[PDB]
Amino acid sequence: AVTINGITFYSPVPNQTYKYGQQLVLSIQSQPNALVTLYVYDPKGNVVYNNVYQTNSSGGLTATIATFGSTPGFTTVGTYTVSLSVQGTTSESASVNVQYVPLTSTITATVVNQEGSPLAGATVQLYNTTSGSNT
Amino acid sequence: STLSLVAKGAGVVEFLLTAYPYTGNITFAPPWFIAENVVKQPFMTYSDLQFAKTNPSAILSLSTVNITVVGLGGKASVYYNSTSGQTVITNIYGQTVATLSG
Amino acid sequence: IVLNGKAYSLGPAGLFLLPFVTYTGSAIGANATAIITVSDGVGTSTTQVPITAENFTPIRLAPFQVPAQVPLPNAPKLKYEYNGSIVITPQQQVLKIYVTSILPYPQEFQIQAFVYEASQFNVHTGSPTAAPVYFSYSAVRAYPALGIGTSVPNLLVYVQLQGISNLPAGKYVIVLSAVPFAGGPVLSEYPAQLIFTNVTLTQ
């Protein structure tokens, strides 16, 4: 486990890649009773998640932060800044440069005849009929 | 019944330890700051429990079945595990490295 | 715990100590090593930075204003709010701080200089409000002593920047961080970073 000292970050660790659908859970053994505003900035520098927590007597915070890949802003590729702004009397900071992966999909069309030889020249039109009209 | 007890308080586990380092030299006292809170306080199944139950505070010779140490990753503990009468020593991810008879 | 002469392992000792750093997932503490590649414009070299339990001591970043041999262990572990104003005149291309360590300390490392606007770091919070707008590093190769009078284990750290013609005038908040040298030593504490809030660069 990493620590930029004052925060025992059980997670995240610097330069970590989060997946499609994966949960950030903010597990940081830090100093009791402080105002821990985690700004989960996306790569455009706006707060797609933001919430102010407070570490308990043990010191562990447990909070599932973000559901990546299922919220706008956890859809955009590049370096997020997972920024703790720790407000006590004397404020402290943390900058964690974390990533995300993109996606796309692929479909197949196979043709065959009664002679068992794949035809060459059969046109196959693929429309997106989800809307209820041939997109 | 458990009312007033011996060992009703609990130990202290200091942050700066009675530990020494090693690499090739045993000497030096490195900052032991056991990271970001020990959450404190040894707990113990009293050795002579049944009569300790009625002791307001007396001086016995206890056998201590937890010592609380919490740093990075997991938490370590040390204790003379009174149940099999065997000193259990553990790690900060926790495995019994030692069962030492009596 | 070596009880009566018989070593009884208690798990990783770096987790009982501070400093400890698992920088980029690669854990470094007491009884560690960094072999570091440095393949550069002059060719390639490779330093080796072996870490010893008894090099342990916090590595502070303290500003100019604080003398070099004067510690701050009663300021925070992570960042102390420097609310003063460094005036960088245009004869200066260099940011002056004292890295304070009161032990012989040989471990080679760097300072990452992540420059930000003070609208790119809200000066009413401790938020760097985006990804570094420009990054430039200074590999500060510490010296245990080359003789006090030659190099001192209390270092005058003069962060020079390439692209101080890629940085023009403006009110910055700069984040200097005692950073491992891309897989380098254990570092940092009291305070681990220094963040300079009413700076005004002038070129």
UniProtKB/Swiss-Prot annotation, chain C:
| Reported modifications of this chain | Glycosylated. C-terminal glycosylation sites are modified with a heterogeneous family of glycans, with the largest having a composition Glc(1)Man(2)GlcNAc(2) plus 6-sulfoquinovose (QuiS).
Task: Give compartment(s).
Answer: Secreted, Cell wall, S-layer
Q: Which residues are glycosylated?
A: N31, N55, N83, N198
Q: What does this protein do?
A: S-layer large protein. May form the highly ordered outer sheath.
Could you say which protein family the record assigns here? Belongs to the Sulfolobales SlaA family.
Subunit info here reads:
The mushroom-shaped unit cells of the Sulfolobales' S-layers may consist of three SlaB subunits and six SlaA subunits.
Q: What is this protein called?
A: S-layer protein A
**Coverage span on the entire protein:** 1222 to 1424 of 1424
